[PDB]
Amino acid sequence: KLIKLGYHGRAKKIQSEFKVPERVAWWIRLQALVAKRDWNEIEEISRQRKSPIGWEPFFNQVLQAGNPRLAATFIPKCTNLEPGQTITMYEKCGMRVKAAEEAVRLKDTEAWNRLLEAAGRNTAEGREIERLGATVFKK
Amino acid sequence: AEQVRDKARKDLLHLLEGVRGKKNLVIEKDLAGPLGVIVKASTLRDYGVDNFFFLENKNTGTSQRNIVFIARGESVRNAHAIAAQIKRIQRESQTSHDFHIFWVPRRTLFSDKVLEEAGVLGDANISELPLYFFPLERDVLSLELNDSFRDLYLAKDPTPVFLLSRALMGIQKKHGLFPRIIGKGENAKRVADLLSRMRQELLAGEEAGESDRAGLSPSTTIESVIIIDREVDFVTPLLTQLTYEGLIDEYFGIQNNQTDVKRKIQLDGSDSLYSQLRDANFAIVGSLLNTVARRLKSDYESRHNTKTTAELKEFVKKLPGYQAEQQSLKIHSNIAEEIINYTRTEIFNKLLEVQQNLAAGADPSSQFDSIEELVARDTPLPQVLRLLCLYSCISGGIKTKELDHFRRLVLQGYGHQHLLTLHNLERLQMFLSKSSPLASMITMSGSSGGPDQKTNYTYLRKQLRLIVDEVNEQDPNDIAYVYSGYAPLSIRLVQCVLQKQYLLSITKGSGTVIAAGPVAGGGAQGWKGFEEIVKHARGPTFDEIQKGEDKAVKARALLSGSSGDKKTVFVVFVGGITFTEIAALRFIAKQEEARRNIVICTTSIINGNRMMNAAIETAT
Amino acid sequence: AFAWLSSHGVYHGKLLLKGPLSELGAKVFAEAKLLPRAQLANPEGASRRQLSTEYVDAVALTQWHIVSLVAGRVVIANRLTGSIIYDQTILNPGQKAVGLCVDQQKSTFWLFTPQEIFEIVPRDEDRDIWKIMLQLQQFDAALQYAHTPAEKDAVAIASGDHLVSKGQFLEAAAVYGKSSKPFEEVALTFIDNEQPDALRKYLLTKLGTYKKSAVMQRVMIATWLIEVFMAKLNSLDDTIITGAELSETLNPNQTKEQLEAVRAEFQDFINKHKGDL
């Protein structure tokens, strides 16, 4: 409630006063900040501080929260637990081009091909997939 | 269990019929539920009952000549509330205002004394109303002593223990005496000893110059009674139920089969969908409701369309069932949504991973991160507290260095009311600590059976198949599926008594135990072949048989039971039984159904959220 | 009620003076309106369209109908809608009306011309009056007055769809029950809309109408009525016992009224047809 109402300084007092674990405080802040849809404060926990949390429970607070554009800044960071998740989550967010970008960064030519299949015959997306493909299967 | 409904109705309705003219009926709210199970308001109105009042809210009136009260006599609350209403009614009433009071099977002198002290009860008609073991479900008999668990273990209040042995006597005295009484635990033994003494009282009445002596013959239809205490298994009650009925109880709570959401539809085993889905695993039931929707829509929205009478009549006679199924299906779909919001949010699956990992003997500290997330997500209080207790109960005591980390989540999860929560957990012995002088797991022949000893899970996990990875959620071959592999001890300690085949397969655990297989398989009677395990559980062991010349004759007839002549078995849980245990007992009862009818008997039905919210409900 | 029938249209208004009043009923026709002879002229030429000087002089009237002839054209209006029901020329083209009148004891109109006198007679005064409303507004009444089953169902649907759209599902149940509309189609609607009362009602209404030869239908559908019947009562009865909290929430006196009303309807019916069930 304190985070949802913007009383972050008070939430910090509570966290230190009652010996609240960092993992607990992080998940509380993330859920409250999602309720307010505060994109910048959410990144401060999972993108800037690299909080040691699962990405599955994390994106359930972002993508299922109707913020696929916010998930887009946490997806490429999933290599800390599983690099394959940097493609799968972008596809779930509708970010077919970004998923192809991750395929390039991880040199995953199979993941790239899946994005091309998703693009199908639509060159509006196919051009971006081919542009990124040049850097996945070339070397 | 349904056979007792007539008896409960018989006495309730008999006393009401004894009241001449029209009457107003006053019912205790904590008894009204159990009463509603046996009779309907219309059943009572057919006997001349007009208005329905309650004691707790002091609801009174002068509209009828006769005023009738129904309440439990095990507490002064009702004696006071009744006297209070009587004094108010007499002051305002312009008529004779005759009063009638119906109490427990044995109206107490205390209750009558308190009533008499009012000074307005002098002409009151006070009589016994022997209602016990209410037919909550076809396979379940409950005394509905909802506060039994809390009082029986917080204050060590034996009230439900005394009521249970009397209630059990109230059945075997009509269907014949149990030829064998067995049980495990301090209160379980008490029930078993009370039953033996009550039999003596039935003969003693003649020697006391009172009632006529009963023959007290052994039953020809009942094989045995198994009594297990709540203290014996303090790990099972701390796991979340994974079955559909469990989803309803874990999220909303089931009482009187009524429950909150609409009180227009009752959900019980008579329902064509509930009988199929109630024991379904949560991972499966999400597909079963869709299976129901497909078969229901095919017969409800289609097939019958444009049909002539000759073919249409097939759907017409079934339509009432389709309409009820559609109404129950929407309700079931709403329950499915409640679980979906915990499985897509890593709440329900997260607590399950903790329960499965602890059950397997994983170091409990490793599950702490998963528990922290559940608290942070503001999941329901009982769902976090169960994980903040189970970890210590499984380990058999943990150092304070680690306990404190879990304890911090208990106070953080409950707020300032956690003080009552921690006190209740200790008193209910559902939380273990290494620093405690009572932190002693029972050892082999280590003078076991004391009140200061605890069940050695860390030993029994090898002695019994308490860890099962073979569970099939859709088509299970084990009770463990209820918890997805927990194979709860409270049930294993009963299965190993009910059948020798269960004893043989259950004790076939670790390589140092399976050698006893051939011994376990010889456990045709009593605790034989199971002594190794019985001795490692909390509390004393009871095993006694019925005396008399014909005891052998009845025993032979009962051990000769067959599918054309099934024999009844009583399984008794003292202090209340959880829904997980009920589902587990139905599973084994079905497997043994070919030879015997196994009935679940309890002091109460414990809601999964009743044990962990004792500090919430008593704090309101 | 009175009406003034004149040249250049007719005058109609409210005559609710009831009985006694002070001085004069000055409120009579206070809101009366003129209907300016729509489609009254006979377009055989400019002089017949102009209608100079001579119009009706007198107009024959019976309940809910106006009969007049102008310039050789005969038009009959239904006062219930204001529309023209009959529109035909004079039988003798060389004749014109000198006025029209009615015998109120014969409910018949007479038309006078210089050479001939004509009578105007309804084929079914009562049904011809009813129909204009039964198929337009009085959809429920139509289920009893209509001689045609097809008409009965057509009006029940128009009424039902309106009633359920506004939220009067109970009233819709009644109009459906009286109609011949198939059993399952309405049951499905009331269920999806979650209206237990409308669901139960439409059959009971039908059963009051169906009489005795139709009783075999009550036997075959008997499981349905008793199951729905009991389900409502189970709620009302369980509500009473459940506990003090629910009793305070849901008015216990309203519950009692529902219990007696519902039980009585079912129990009385099954007794009367007890030999068939």
Please give the count of helices of chain A.
9
Instruction: Identify the strand order in the major beta sheet of chain B.
Output: 6-7-13-11-9-8-10
Helix content bin of chain A: 55-70%
Number of helices of chain B: 27
What percentage of residues of chain B falls in helices of 4 or more residues?
40-55%
PDB class: protein transport
Keywords: hops, membrane fusion
Entry title: Cryo-EM structure of a HOPS core complex containing Vps33, Vps16, and Vps18
Chain A: Vacuolar protein sorting-associated protein 16
Q: How would you describe this protein?
A:
The structure is cut from a larger assembly and holds chains A (139 residues), B (620 residues) and C (277 residues). With 139 residues, chain A is an all-alpha fold. Chain A has 9 helices and no strands. Chain A is elongated and about 55 Å long. Chain B has 620 residues and is of the alpha/beta class. Chain B is 45% helix and 11% strand. In chain B, the strands form 3 sheets. In chain B, strands 6-7-13-11-9-8-10 form a 7-stranded mixed beta sheet, sandwiched between helices. In chain B, strands 2-1-3-4-5 form a 5-stranded parallel beta sheet. By secondary structure, chain C is an alpha+beta fold. In chain C, helix 6 (183-192) packs antiparallel against helix 7 (196-209). Chain C is elongated, with a radius of gyration of 28 Å. The two termini of chain C are 52 Å apart. The B-C interface holds B 27, 29, 32-33, 35-36, 39-45, 51-52, 54, 56-57, 59, 256, 258, 263-266, 301, 304-305, 313, 316-317, 319-320, 323-324, 326-327 and C 183-184, 187-188, 191, 196, 220-221, 223-224, 227-228, 231-248, 252, 259, 263.
